[PDB]
Design a protein around this ligand. Structure first.
Ligand SMILES: Nc1ncnc2c1ncn2[C@@H]1O[C@H](COP(=O)(O)OP(=O)(O)O)[C@@H](O)[C@H]1O
Ligand SMILES: Nc1ncnc2c1ncn2[C@@H]1O[C@H](COP(=O)(O)OP(=O)(O)O)[C@@H](O)[C@H]1O
Ligand SMILES: [Ca+2]
Ligand SMILES: [Ca+2]
Ligand SMILES: [Mg+2]
Ligand SMILES: [Mg+2]
Lengths: 160, 126, 371, 74, 371
């Protein structure tokens, strides 16, 4: 998902110019000015990788939001850093499950968002209340106002 | 919000929860040691007549019997509870597991190799 | 470490590391010694080209498959194929990787025991496990019930499964498969003048079958139409020119699946052995098996088979039950995808046949608890 | 009897844990050692029972989680 | 606190808290181990499905009732059923609730003593009481006299009661019940071609019996009519299609109640054991018993039995007495409703067998004053 967005936002304009020039050199002679799903799939075939057209459509739907089938500058960098998955295994299931079970200090099976507030105060990153609101929206799938254990698994699924 | 700050918040929360859980576990261990030391009382009756020594022997033998009875009963109960917990875990999975099959990708070989296979002779810097 | 999910098959060996989506290396399983004399000196001519190399030099070789019908008839050639698969197509020494072979149902014991003995003595793997080719194809569909018809190239078998409990008394294994269809197509092509005899030209007939043949929805109507119009005659260019035109041989070759009397086999088609396999099951799980009929294997890739089979079963089955035929687009590699999923499971990690166990009980360990 | 078997087995464990407290024939130091043995056994059982209590708390909370998911899966 | 009114029964376990109108959880009492091998790994397959879960997976199980005829023949399975009933269908720990089991008349002592020993040692209830299944059914009718025929699924018993004083010398217990009718129906269905053999298909035959069978008002006339016309043949759809047509098997299955010679039993029908049970009573309470004949239990739910029984008894009884048959619409749960009423009484609150009493006298306390 937005994992590659986070990774490249950690990165700087060096990657921007690097991938721009890489497009200039390798995609030289193209008529579209971007990279298409079929375009990248044929490129993979040319180099020797064998992706499938269904996988091509899946990946382009994942990277393309506007439905264009190509890559915006930020989307282009996200896809370029996407093809390699350096970070995997996303923390540990059991330890984080214990952390979440103790997160419910009231131990009622439900997460008070004030506990989330205090934990975030501990985190202290530059964040507004709407940011944690959006994060909960990302996490509170059933919109119950708390953090469900299964939804806790979902939103932390694969999170390093 | 921007995904970078989102991931930073996620890892910050991971660290916060981990450290708080560890600290609470350590505090629970300290309280356990303190309260258990409070519960069992050290004795000092050396040099006494063996009548009283054996009186203490019998008293503490009975005490050991009582504590063993209680603890073994509680342990059997807890084992039964954990067995039932595993049963319910299996029940929940068989209710709504199935699709929980993970996927691993290796065709996406390291991007350096992909860039080499793409470029070839002109694979000098990328 | 990672596990090697090999899948011997019969016609195409599919292999790759556990946890991916598709096999890493897929290549025909043929070993062909040269047959002519050879006059150039120092050309570096080998004594046996295996795998995909012998599909390019097939003009001067005598290709011979080492697996006839599921069973293995030529152990030296099979050992050569495995050695090639490990060392040249994957380039991973087997000393550091578990292996997960696959085997058809109802196969001779000696075949399986020899397979495990080879894997443990020659290649010296850490641990290997043998699995039935249909359970994997059921894994790949993400189901847990259903009756799977795995019509490979060697043998077609039909294993029904319910709630994870396989029904050993309802497995119907039939030995008609892709190879017999290739031979029958090669035999009916002679009715127009094209004669293919050499074992190398069997590959050309196989390519014709793959690219042109299709399964007719209704056989008699197609036979009548192809005999009046000429809208079916599709042409194909041989490896040297001289295009050929296939008429009603197009849907007569794969029709043998539903009428095995064409090649002289007595048994009933794949449309009726599935219904018989269902009817042997208990009376209370027949609805679920009707609704979750799964297709797999290469030979079930003919264009238009998922409709003919559904029509036939709906004709046979009671009118109330719903008949549904699951035909995923990734049919060919379904068994291997399922094998990867099974090898990637944590619960399965203690079912491997560890080498010390083999040292204590001999090759007959495979029939024991570690199945 | 399975319940009979359970009761008999638990009573057997009860009997086994009953060590031979036949020790008046000992001297002062040996009896002090035996008393320390009993004391350490009691404290270890205290640790075991505390572990049982915290694990039971965890088991109850996880059963609450299980029932929550059951209700969610109507 | 509230009392748990459990009612073991034989065929359906009915339970619920005291003071309500209907049992909270009603589910068949069957425990079925799987019988096939099972090939899917990690599917979470248990070793025994009890209660209503084993009526959905019955296609691959071997269901076996733990209660044969009132008596309990397999104590481990019965303990499993009780554990399921307490923990999963009611979700109330038994450590905080009195229990009120029910037991058929004239049952072996050891059964009752083992029942109380289990309830006090394994589940560790505060106090339990065992009551005769017919007195409760008399409670539910709001009467205080009357002779109740409680034709369950295990055993049919006929307890006469007057003014609250039970007559122990006039209890006529007969072992023909719903299960024997199911077996006889399964045996006469074979006369048309339908063969049900598996222990899972006994459930299908039970469903046929429940939905189609009825008691004929006059047997010979119905046998003559069904043999000439075809207005009786009702069809029924099996769990997989292939509808079946039941002819004069409809009223021949439940006719066994009034002529137990059909299944080879010597004794007289339920129409004549009631009259015999009345005639053993004193000469001055026969009119009241004639006027207050009560029906209960599941098997007395056949459409048209309250008229056949009245006709038969009127034929047997003297012409002056009035014969009335009380057949409440809530017949099936009559025993449990009566149990709830009895457990809700204040006068009854001191009759429970308190645990300290059991500790002082052992399991043989149940035969003592606390009956
Ligand atoms: N696209 C296709 N159309 C028709 N037939 C095919 C197609 N692909 C493969 N086949 C047939 O299936 C066979 C390959 O089957 P496969 O599933 O590889 O067998 P195995 O089970 O031994 O792996 C080939 O011999 C070919 O005859
Ligand atoms: N509606 C019905 N019509 C005919 N027979 C029925 C009906 N309902 C239940 N039965 C029969 O009664 C039996 C259930 O009797 P029940 O009263 O539950 O026995 P118990 O006394 O053990 O609870 C079933 O086995 C079935 O054969
Ligand atoms: Ca886009
Ligand atoms: Ca909380
Ligand atoms: Mg295959
Ligand atoms: Mg009853």
């Amino acid at each position: 998902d937005d994992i590659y967005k986070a990774a490249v936002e950690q990165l700087t304009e060096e990657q921007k110019n690097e991938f721009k020039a890489a497009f200039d050199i390798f995609v030289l002679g193209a008529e579209d000015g971007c990279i298409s799903t079929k375009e990248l799939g044929k490129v993979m075939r040319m180099l020797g990788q064998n992706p499938t057209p269904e996988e091509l459509q899946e990946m382009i739907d994942e990277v393309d939001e506007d439905g264009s089938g190509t890559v915006d500058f930020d989307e282009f960098l996200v896809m370029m850093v996407r093809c390699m998955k350096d970070d995997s295994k996303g923390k540990s299931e059991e330890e984080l499950s214990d952390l979440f079970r103790m997160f419910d200090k009231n131990a009622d099976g439900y997460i008070d968002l004030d506990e989330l507030k205090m934990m975030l105060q501990a985190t202290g990153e530059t964040i507004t209340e709407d940011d944690i609101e959006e994060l909960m929206k990302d996490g509170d799938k059933n919109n119950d106002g708390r953090i469900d254990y299964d939804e806790f698994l979902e939103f932390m699924k694969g999170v390093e | 919000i921007s995904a970078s700050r989102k991931l930073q918040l996620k890892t910050l929360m991971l660290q916060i929860a981990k450290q708080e859980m560890e600290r609470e576990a350590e505090e629970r261990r300290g309280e356990k040691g303190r309260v258990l030391r409070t519960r069992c009382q050290p004795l000092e009756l050396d040099g006494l007549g063996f009548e009283e020594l054996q009186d203490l022997c019998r008293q503490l033998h009975a005490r050991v019997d009582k504590v063993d009875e209680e603890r073994y009963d509680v342990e059997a109960k807890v084992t039964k509870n954990i067995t039932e917990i595993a049963d319910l875990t299996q029940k929940i999975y068989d209710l709504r597991g199935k699709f929980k099959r993970p996927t691993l990708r290796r065709v996406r070989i390291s991007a350096d190799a992909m860039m080499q296979a793409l470029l070839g002779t002109r694979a000098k810097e990328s | 470490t990672t596990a090697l999910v090999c899948d011997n098959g019969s016609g195409l060996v599919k292999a790759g590391f556990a946890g991916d989506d598709a096999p890493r290396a897929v290549f025909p399983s043929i070993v062909g010694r040269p047959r002519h004399q050879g006059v150039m000196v120092g050309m570096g001519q080998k004594d046996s080209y295996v795998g995909d190399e012998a599909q390019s030099k097939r003009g001067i070789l005598t290709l011979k498959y080492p697996i006839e019908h599921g069973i293995i008839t030529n152990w030296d050639d099979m050992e050569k194929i495995w050695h090639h698969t490990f060392y040249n197509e994957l380039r991973v020494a087997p000393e550091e990787h578990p292996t997960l072979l696959t085997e058809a149902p109802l196969n001779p014991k000696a075949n399986r025991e020899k397979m495990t003995q080879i894997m443990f003595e020659t290649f010296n793997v850490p641990a290997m496990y043998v699995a039935i080719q249909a359970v994997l194809s059921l894994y790949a569909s993400g189901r847990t019930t259903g009756i799977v018809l795995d019509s490979g190239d060697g043998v077609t078998h039909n294993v029904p499964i319910y709630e994870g409990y396989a029904l050993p008394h309802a497995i119907m294994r039939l030995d008609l498969a892709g190879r017999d269809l290739t031979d029958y197509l090669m035999k009916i092509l002679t009715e127009r003048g094209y004669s293919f005899v050499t074992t190398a030209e069997r590959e050309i007939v196989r390519d014709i079958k793959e690219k042109l043949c299709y399964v007719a929805l209704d056989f008699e109507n197609e036979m009548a139409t192809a005999a009046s119009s000429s809208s079916l005659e599709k042409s194909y260019e041989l490896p040297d020119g001289q295009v050929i035109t296939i008429g009603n041989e197009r849907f007569r070759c794969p029709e043998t699946l539903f009428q095995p009397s064409f090649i002289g086999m007595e048994s009933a088609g794949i449309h009726e052995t599935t219904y018989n396999s269902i009817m042997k099951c208990d009376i209370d799980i027949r609805k679920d098996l009707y609704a979750n009929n799964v297709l797999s294997g290469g030979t079930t890739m003919y264009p238009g088979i998922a409709d003919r089979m559904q029509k036939e079963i709906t004709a046979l089955a009671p009118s109330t039950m719903k008949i549904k035929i699951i035909a995923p687009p990734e049919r060919k590699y379904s068994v291997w995808i399922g094998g990867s999923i099974l090898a990637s499971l944590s619960t399965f990690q203690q079912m491997w046949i560890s080498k010390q166990e083999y040292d204590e009980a001999g090759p007959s360990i495979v029939h024991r608890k570690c199945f | 009897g399975k319940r009979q078997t359970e009761r008999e087995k638990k009573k057997k464990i009860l009997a086994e844990r009953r060590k031979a407290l036949a020790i008046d024939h000992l001297n002062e130091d040996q009896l002090r050692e035996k008393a320390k043995e009993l004391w350490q056994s009691i404290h270890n059982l205290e640790a075991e029972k505390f572990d049982l209590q915290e694990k039971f708390k965890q088991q109850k909370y996880e059963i609450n989680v299980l029932r929550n998911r059951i209700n969610d899966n109507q």
